[PDB]
Design a protein around this ligand. Structure first.
Ligand SMILES: Nc1nc2c(ncn2[C@@H]2O[C@H](COP(=O)(O)OP(=O)(O)O)[C@@H](O)[C@H]2O)c(=O)[nH]1
Ligand SMILES: Nc1nc2c(ncn2[C@@H]2O[C@H](COP(=O)(O)OP(=O)(O)O)[C@@H](O)[C@H]2O)c(=O)[nH]1
Lengths: 242, 239
């Protein structure tokens, strides 16, 4: 199992969608989603609670995730069979917050922390510490929770998103070179679709080429471009289980 | 007094430079007590250098750097200027969550305790600083401000990096006090970027770009007279 841990809007769901090749997640996560990816000739999806029913429409998978959510600790089990995926089990976890919004409980931070802790305390669970690049890495809730249960970094891979959203005159070179805050497995830089790209109905195919172009064109990341991007992250997660 | 609270790199020190009207801070370890005094003559005074009047703000930066070397004892600085209002600012170190290099393992809680020393004081106005390119529900500043001021009686929300927001996004619901309502509402600011600091861009030029940003933004246009740092200075003055 691979748990996606980070603050709210870190880019966790976008990472999962890139691994599928189809848009199927709602845009926020209230329950943990156990997403099993299975390499198959036939492309379809099925829910644990929705036995027998196969889904060929990924918009209907999203509506079913939305229907089942309507925070809670009981997980939603989803299996996607696809020729484009690897054999990996990922857990979409709700994002860590600090202040409750609307009719949310006041201890929501400590409930989401408790929920994540049930998954990441297990020795065979690999932690994907997702942190946006346009935030200070020392302030990462993802790294703090990962160091708590895994101090040595034996099962921690740092994920740096929103690298295209960094302020002019800055880069995350020292972070991505594993220098500012070293991890045993290091960091993998990713560039997901912006809010505009999603509303503009941009493909996951067009996202990956723009992502590869970004790392090859950036002067601060060009020298490490083959250690970057979502395909390399999928490769590293596969290389451990295989 | 006014305590500037946030996570690291939130844009706290930038507020102090916009209030002063001159770039003067090195690029927080120790707290900074910046007392602003409206004066005809423009100069800066340090308590430890009792007597010396500083006229070169690049020499004020060199002294802040030299005196700093985390600790709770603050560097006390007075800035006499015709463009400032009679206010005291507490530039508190930004809270982090993971120790970097030789920093103590309990650094986060060490910073929190030091911030708590100031924000537990009843006649201390809390300036909750949150960048716009981060989710407001994740605000370290707002959590800490709500821990000592649950009613929001002495909390003013400050939103930085509105120019760094993703394409197809805005903080209108935040600045309209709808997402996370605060009694005293929110003030949006546009500070010097990292290129602007490196390129030594003037504060006057940065305050002019901040003004044109709110006047131009189709999502902040209607509230432009409630936005910007000169308005934030005016709000902290009235109180
Ligand atoms: N520009 C840019 N936007 C991103 C990136 N990753 C996520 N986003 C945007 O940030 C918001 C949050 O992304 P999401 O994956 O839903 O975050 P989650 O709550 O952690 O699952 C969405 O509006 C995304 O379009 C990125 O790498 N670059
Ligand atoms: N583009 C942009 N950059 C900002 C803004 N506010 C702060 N920054 C940058 O963010 C970094 C941290 O700013 P700083 O004032 O030192 O934050 P502090 O550590 O909280 O005191 C600096 O490189 C600033 O240039 C803003 O509104 N817009």
């Amino acid at each position: 199992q691979i748990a996606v841990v980070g603050g709210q809007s870190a880019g966790k769901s976008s990472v999962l969608e890139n691994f599928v090749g189809r848009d199927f997640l709602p845009r926020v996560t209230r329950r943990p989603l156990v997403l099993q990816l299975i390499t198959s000739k036939a492309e379809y999806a099925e829910f644990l609670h929705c036995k027998g029913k196969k889904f060929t429409d990924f918009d209907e998978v999203r509506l079913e995730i939305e229907a089942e959510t309507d925070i809670s600790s009981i997980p939603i089990n989803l299996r996607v069979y696809s020729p484009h995926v690897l054999n990996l089990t990922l857990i979409d976890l709700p994002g860590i917050t600090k202040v409750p919004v609307g009719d949310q409980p006041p201890d929501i931070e400590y409930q989401i922390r408790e929920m994540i802790m049930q998954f990441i305390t297990r020795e065979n669970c690999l932690i994907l510490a997702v942190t946006p690049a346009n935030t200070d890495l020392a302030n990462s809730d993802a790294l703090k929770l990962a160091k708590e249960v895994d101090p040595q970094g034996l099962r921690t891979i740092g994920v740096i998103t929103k690298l295209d959203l960094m302020d002019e005159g800055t880069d995350a070179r020292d972070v991505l070179e594993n220098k500012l805050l070293p991890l045993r497995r290091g960091y993998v830089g990713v560039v997901n679709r912006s809010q505009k790209d999603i509303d503009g109905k941009k493909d996951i195919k067009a996202a990956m080429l723009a992502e590869r172009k970004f790392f090859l064109s950036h002067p601060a990341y060009r020298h490490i471009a083959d250690r970057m991007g979502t395909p390399h992250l999928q490769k590293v997660l596969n290389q451990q289980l295989t």
